[PDB]
């Protein structure tokens, strides 16, 4: 697939959840595969299986963000609607500024519609709308695809 969509963010933001919900190739996932969505063909990245090789927490969280916006087209810039905006949310936000490219944010574990409003405190970071999805329960998915490949 010729677009290339790399997810970035910190830790346990459920990255590579949906990293394998999404890809064709089956760390916590093949990093780089071939995906697949419907009329969807593009190559997707989990940027949180890059080893950045021993440097501090908020050097490496930068350095897959700055890879991101290397290799990609669109970055879904994934946060933990659990945990609210994070001062590393804030960190990532602050490199992803540095973009043109499309970044649609994706607020995870979001795991039921009653869960929703958890979303208003990410319009914070400023990359408008967030999306909220839930890898393990499979939600919210279409949508967020929907929004990334609108970018295509
Ligand atoms: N409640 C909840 N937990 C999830 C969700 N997605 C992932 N997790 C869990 O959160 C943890 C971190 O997920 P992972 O995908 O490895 O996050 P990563 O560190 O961003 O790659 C694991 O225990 C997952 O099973 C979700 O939608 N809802
Ligand atoms: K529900
Ligand atoms: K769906
Ligand atoms: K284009
Ligand atoms: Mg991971």
Redesign the pocket.
């Known amino acids: 697939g010729k677009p290339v969509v790399a997810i970035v963010?910190?830790?346990?933001?459920?990255?590579?959840?949906?990293?394998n919900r999404i890809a064709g190739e089956r760390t916590?996932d093949r990093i780089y595969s071939s995906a697949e969505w419907l009329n969807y063909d593009f190559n997707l990245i989990?940027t949180?299986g890059i080893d950045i090789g021993d440097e501090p927490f908020l050097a490496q969280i930068r350095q897959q963000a700055e890879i991101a916006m290397d290799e990609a087209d669109v970055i879904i810039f994934?946060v933990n609607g659990?945990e609210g905006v994070t001062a590393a949310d804030e960190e990532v936000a602050k490199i992803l500024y540095r973009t043109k490219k499309p970044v649609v944010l994706a607020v995870?574990?979001?795991?039921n519609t009653e869960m929703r409003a958890n979303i208003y405190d990410f319009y914070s970071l400023g990359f408008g709308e967030p999306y909220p999805?839930?890898?393990?329960?499979g939600?919210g998915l279409g949508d967020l695809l929907d929004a990334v490949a609108e970018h295509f």
Do not use: A
């Open positions: 963010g910190r830790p346990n933001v459920g990255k590579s959840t949906i990293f916590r989990d949180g994934m659990r995870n574990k979001l795991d999805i839930s890898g393990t329960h939600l």
